[PDB]
Amino acid sequence: AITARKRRPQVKLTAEKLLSDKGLPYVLKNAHKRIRISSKKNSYDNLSNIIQFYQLWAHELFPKAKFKDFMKICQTVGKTDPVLREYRVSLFRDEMGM
Amino acid sequence: AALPSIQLPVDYNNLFNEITDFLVTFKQDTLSGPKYMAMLQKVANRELNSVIIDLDDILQYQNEKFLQGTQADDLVSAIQQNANHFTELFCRAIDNNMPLPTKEIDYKDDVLDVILNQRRLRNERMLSDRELFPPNLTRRYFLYFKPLSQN
Amino acid sequence: LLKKIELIFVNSLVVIYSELEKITLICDKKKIKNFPLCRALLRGQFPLLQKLTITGVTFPMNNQDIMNFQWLLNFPDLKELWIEDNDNCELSKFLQLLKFSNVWKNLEKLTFRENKLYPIVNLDEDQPVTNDDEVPSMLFYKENLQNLEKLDLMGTSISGSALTRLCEQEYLDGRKLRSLNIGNCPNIQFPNNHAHTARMILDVNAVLKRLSKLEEINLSHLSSLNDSTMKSFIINVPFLENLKRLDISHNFEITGISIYEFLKKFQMDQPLAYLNIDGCSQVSHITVNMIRAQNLVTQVDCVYERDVWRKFGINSYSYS
């Protein structure tokens, strides 16, 4: 019987991983706590105040890709997964149920 | 590339046990804790950076054990024959046995303590589902074999 | 309805079974870090199980019932046992089982191969008495091993005296034994060696007297078989007239001198049927060409470049 023959394993960002606790639930837990926007600061600083959280979260979730590439993959997988669509509409369904 | 293999008159699991038993047992009682555990306590307090192993002590330990009737496998002859390996064995015995410090040393300024503490915190988070190092990194002392005196 | 089941657990990711006849469990020892059928094998019975083959698994440390082969008592009628590279097993615990139960009415073949060098095992011939006013414990080595045709102990750290005692006690039957593999056993020394501890000696003269009708010997990786030690085989040629197939390959010591004079005295018996000396760096090419030319062996293999011996399926069920 067959003694082993090799193959190359691979990993990428995926909707299940993006739906794990360290994915979007981490955002719902931490984003409103960590981002703060104020009229007391210029636009560049406020934009950075948004971006710093999402960049650190994106790295800690999936350290392979650059932040811009991460955003592109997030947009495309968001465009093309039913589970992620269900979760996303479920957030606003919950807000509608408030 | 395969290799043949042979049997030899040595067993390092056994000699490791012999070494650690020596290390926790011996003292120079004729001069009236165990000598080496006291020296390791001095290492723990970072007052001493060298461990000097005496082959005279291993001889007297062998003589005591042989007087008590057990065989002792002549560790002196073994570690005169292949001393390089036995530095590693003695350091493993020390890195197991070495006690905690009795005196405080302002520990927070030690880089290797800080870096391995940060590693341990991260590994606790990993192990909470949210060796630790190569041993030489944590081994501050240096170990030396002192020869047999002529007698 | 399943009679023969095989599982080859190539990777890891995170009651009565009368039907069964052959269970083959093979594992990638690097990837598999436990023992799959542990609960099933110890709890259940497989009463018609003819052959069992477990390789590459790792026995748990937390369970002396596993380590002492206590489960293995579950399977009478077990015509063959093969067990190989089971990293936390020991031949010592196995022989302790064999001491204290008539565990098997019949083994036609036994094959045990632990991987790492556990300490010396001697045949534990101690027959204790609870009191001399009470029976000595009947030692079941004879009736357990009396049936064997094939005994294979490659790599198992058995001492040479242990095997002689198996023959002097006639626990190994001889009249039924046909193939013996003791390769890669570092605790074997032959009588001509001046350097030893006496209980590592193999008395090949006694052994070959006992079990003379055997066909197939394997001494591969038996580095202790230097040219001087081969002289013991030369003088014991009269006791191995049944021998057809001789594997002594991957011996880095054995010069072509011993090979040649062994085949020459064997020729005083008609060639030896088959001989394997792959990887033996010291057999001179002209000598083995003489062996072919003068036709002292019907087939002889001299693939000097063959680094390893474990042909999967043929020689071993350890995975890859």
Curated annotation (Swiss-Prot), chain A:
Domain of life: Eukaryota
Entry's family note: Belongs to the CSM3 family.
Functional summary from the UniProt entry: Forms a fork protection complex (FPC) with TOF1 which is required for chromosome segregation during meiosis and DNA damage repair. FPC coordinates leading and lagging strand synthesis and moves with the replication fork. FPC stabilizes replication forks in a configuration that is recognized by replication checkpoint sensors and protects stalled replication forks against the fork-releasing activity of RRM3 helicase.
Gene encoding the protein: CSM3
Protein name stated in the entry: Chromosome segregation in meiosis protein 3
Species assigned in the record: Saccharomyces cerevisiae (strain ATCC 204508 / S288c)
Organism taxonomic ancestry: Eukaryota, Fungi, Dikarya, Ascomycota, Saccharomycotina
Included stretch of the parent chain: 42 to 139 of 317
Cellular localization per UniProt: Nucleus
Record text on subunit structure and interactions: Component of the fork protection complex (FPC) consisting of TOF1 and CSM3.
Miscellaneous comment: Present with 358 molecules/cell in log phase SD medium.
Cysteines paired by S-S bonds: none
From Swiss-Prot, chain C:
Transmembrane segments: none
Residue ranges of LRR repeats: 20-44, 75-100, 104-127, 145-169, 174-197, 211-232, 240-264
Subcellular localization, as worded in the UniProt entry: Nucleus
Assembly and binders: Component of the SCF(DIA2) complex containing CDC53, SKP1, RBX1 and DIA2. Interacts with SKP1.
Similarity comment: family membership: Belongs to the DIA2 family.
Described function: F-box protein component of a SCF (SKP1-CUL1-F-box protein) E3 ubiquitin-protein ligase complex which mediates the ubiquitination and subsequent proteasomal degradation of target proteins. Probably recognizes and binds to phosphorylated target proteins. The SCF(DIA2) complex is specifically involved in the pheromone induced degradation of phosphorylated TEC1. The SCF(DIA2) complex binds to DNA replication origins.
UniProt-recorded name of the protein: Protein DIA2
Natural source organism: Saccharomyces cerevisiae (strain ATCC 204508 / S288c) (Baker's yeast)
Section of the entire sequence shown: 366 to 732 of 732
